[PDB]
Amino acid sequence: AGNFELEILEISNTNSHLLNGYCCGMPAELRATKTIGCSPCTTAFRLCLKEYQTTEQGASISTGCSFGNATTKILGGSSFVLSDPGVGAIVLPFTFRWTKSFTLILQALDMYNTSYPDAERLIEETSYSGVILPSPEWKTLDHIGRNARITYRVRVQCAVTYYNTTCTTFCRPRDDQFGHYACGSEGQKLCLNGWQGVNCEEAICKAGCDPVHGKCDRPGECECRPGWRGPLCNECMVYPGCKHGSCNGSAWKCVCDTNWGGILCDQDLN
Ligand SMILES: *[C@@H]1O[C@H](CO)[C@@H](O[C@@H]2O[C@H](CO)[C@@H](O)[C@H](O)[C@H]2NC(C)=O)[C@H](O)[C@H]1NC(C)=O
Ligand SMILES: [Ca+2]
């Protein structure tokens, strides 16, 4: 999941015309003003996003906008450069996996409403088909049309906690008892130094720490299980009172040396 983002950067429509060659706003004949020339446009932008299209008919908004459609607020007059493109950005959410391939249709529209909608109010129209991967980097596009020049930019970003080219790999970094890991560029758990395991919840103990009789709750340490000792927890403790004997790799035992017997190995056998 994530969003396809489009930010208008500039439109240049110096003569305040429509694509059909007429003026924006009210026809000058119907105006009761001293204004000379065309009235200014009231420009907004409509984005139609859809699957990658292999023919000219696909570059129309008549084939539908499966990936979403939106219209900005009025962003300015006939020509303007947006100092802060983010405020009027078009954000189209997508669910499941990002498609990578797409076709967009971007229209500039004169929002002068008299009989309410009409297609004569198209100022300019452009289309772009391509393949884009999730990234905060913008792709800048520039359309020098017959009537207006539109500069805009697009990007795709995964929803928060999602990664990978598909925006479906989940990762949330953790630094507590249940895990110690950062998130990689594709959502991989990157264990913090000294940790391992499925959730990077296992401390990596001191080098040489006995894997069976040693443990650690913090990296680089070696704590001994009952009846074992030494810096590496590899030395068993003999049963208290054991004389001529050893633990033989088992905690609290007294296994006799040759020619000694008894529970404490203190009986000379010969
Ligand atoms: C990023 O997306 C790709 C696309 O699926 C993942 O790579 C594929 O899937 C397996 C995982 O089971 C990878 O080991 C292979 O290298 C890829 N196989 C094919 C046929 O493309 C990749 O795993 C994703 N990254 C993460 C962290 O999930
Ligand atoms: Ca023009």
Numbering used by the authors: 80 to 349
Sentences from the paper on this structure:
The Notch signalling pathway is highly conserved and plays key roles in many aspects of development and homeostasis. Canonical Notch signalling involves a simple cascade, whereby ligand binding induces successive cleavages to release the Notch intracellular domain (NICD) which translocates to the nucleus and directly regulates gene expression with its binding partners (Kovall, 2008; Kovall & Blacklow, 2010; Bray, 2016; Kovall et al, 2017). All Notch ligands have a similar architecture, with an extracellular domain consisting of multiple (7, 8, or 16) epidermal growth factor (EGF) repeats, a so‐called Delta/Serrate/Lag‐2 (DSL) domain and a highly conserved N‐terminal region (Bray, 2006; D’Souza et al, 2008; Kopan & Ilagan, 2009; Kovall & Blacklow, 2010). Receptor binding involves the N‐terminal portion including the DSL and N‐terminal domains (Cordle et al, 2008; Luca et al, 2015, 2017).
To determine whether the Drosophila ligands adopt the same arrangement as their mammalian counterparts, we solved the structures of the N‐terminal region of Drosophila Delta and Serrate as well as the ligand‐binding region of Drosophila Notch (EGF11‐13; Fig EV1A–E). Notable exceptions to the overall conserved arrangements are the β1‐2 and β5‐6 loops which exhibit different lengths and folding in the ligands. B–E The crystallographic asymmetric units are shown for the three structures (B) Delta—one copy of C2‐DSL‐EGF1 construct; (C) Serrate—two copies of C2‐DSL‐EGF1‐EGF2 construct; (D) C2 domain of Drosophila Delta (rainbow colouring) overlaid on the same region of Drosophila Serrate (grey). Disulphide bonds are shown as yellow sticks and the bound calcium ion in the Serrate structure as a grey sphere. The β1‐2 loop (blue for Delta, at top) adopts a different conformation in Delta than in Serrate despite conservation of the two stabilizing disulphides; (E) Notch—one copy of EGF11‐13. Likewise, the equivalent fragment containing SerrateΔβ1‐2 loop deletion (removal of residues LRATK) also exhibited reduced binding to liposomes, although to a variable extent that was not reproducibly significant. This may be due to differences in the lipid‐binding specificities because we have previously noted the heterogeneity of the C2 loop sequences in different ligand families and hypothesized that they may confer different lipid‐binding specificities (Suckling et al, 2017). Combining SerΔβ1‐2 allele with this double‐mutant chromosome enhanced the thickening of veins in a similar manner to DlΔβ1‐2.
